Amino acid sequence: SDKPVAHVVANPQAEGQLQWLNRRANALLANGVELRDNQLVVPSEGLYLIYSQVLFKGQGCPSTHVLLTHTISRIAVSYQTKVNLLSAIKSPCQPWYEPIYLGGVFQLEKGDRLSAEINRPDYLDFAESGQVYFGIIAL
Amino acid sequence: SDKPVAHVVANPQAEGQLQWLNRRANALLANGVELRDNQLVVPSEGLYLIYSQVLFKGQGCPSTHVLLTHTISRIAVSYQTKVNLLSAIKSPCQPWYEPIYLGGVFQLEKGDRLSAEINRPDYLDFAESGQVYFGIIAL
Amino acid sequence: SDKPVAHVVANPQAEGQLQWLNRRANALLANGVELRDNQLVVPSEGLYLIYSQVLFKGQGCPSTHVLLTHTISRIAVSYQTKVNLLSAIKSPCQPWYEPIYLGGVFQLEKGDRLSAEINRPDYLDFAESGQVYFGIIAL
């Protein structure tokens, strides 16, 4: 049980924000992985499977064309640059539900940080369990 | 080739039900993983990548607002509780197609069971290959 | 750092086609994995996590019902057959955005090839980073 690993969930008690949380039940933040300033911190150099899901929910369709996005970004320790690794966009309106799942394998450096960010936290459905999550595992 | 592994598909011959099946071609149920009462059985304690996809298909939009869901749940041997690990909801109607993909890393115990369940098997498009699947791998 | 691995992206300079590319930054094609005729080539027998995402984007809804598909297929060296491993279909019209994510674990043979293919490259949104990707990792 020594591989760097994390599986964090959106805080169901937060309001209008995507706040990642490690839980006692069915969530992970182990073997060097830390949560700092809402970002996952890589403890060692290597290959990592990185993934995240968000679910957006709205009661109806507003007057202005809504675009939803979910993104996983890499903040390199060496440079402090912030690069898009995985992302997608959805338009729910031409109650609605829009899940977005992202996942991929990346070479990361020790101290690099990962953020999983959205644009419309007012539409984030984080109260319902299993819908909003972010994780990594060293391979 | 010793890691617990499974990649099961929806039985294309089943009717109005999500029935997981191990196939000869491009499907797995090896190294201790069993399929029992339509659920995957964990042979050993450890970290597992768990994933599933379903695809819903309908010919049109009915009079009552349809909600579709896909869920992966953990049945702990120690407790017999059934907890939601990964889930999403979609509303296809404000022929239609709605895929849902779920995936994440979890610490599981030997004898724990995993179920991948939906609410509208009458909308499940399991006849078309590669669309409906459920799998795990010990990491 | 010896596991066969790949994480390739759609060439943002290609036109009306899905052309996979290994990049200097945040992309991989290592430890025996090759890109040949737009397909990933397996260097050794074993279990692989395989995944891909595409994002389709259109300016409006045309007169004929558009169906979008994304598929991951296995070309066996031993047979030259081409089998569907993972796929999904979406109908964007009853500017729109349709992401499709596919991922699963498969036993592959050395020399097998994997293709990640779509039907409407005229709708592929490959100019925007992190949206179109294809990868594998030996587990």
Author numbering:
A (entry chain A), B (entry chain A), C (entry chain A): 9 to 102, 113 to 157
Anything the authors wrote about it?
Tumor necrosis factor (TNF) is a pleiotropic cytokine with beneficial functions in immune regulation and host defense, but deleterious pro-inflammatory and cytotoxic functions during inflammation. TNF signaling is mediated by binding to two cell-surface receptors: TNF receptor type 1 (TNFR1 or p55), expressed in most tissues, or TNF receptor type 2 (TNFR2 or p75), which is inducible and typically found in cells of the immune system. To better understand and rationalize the activities of the three Nanobodies™, the crystal structures of the complexes of VHH#1, VHH#2, and VHH#3 with TNF were determined. In agreement with SEC data, each of the three Nanobodies™ associates with the trimeric TNF to form a hetero-hexameric TNF-Nanobody™ complex.
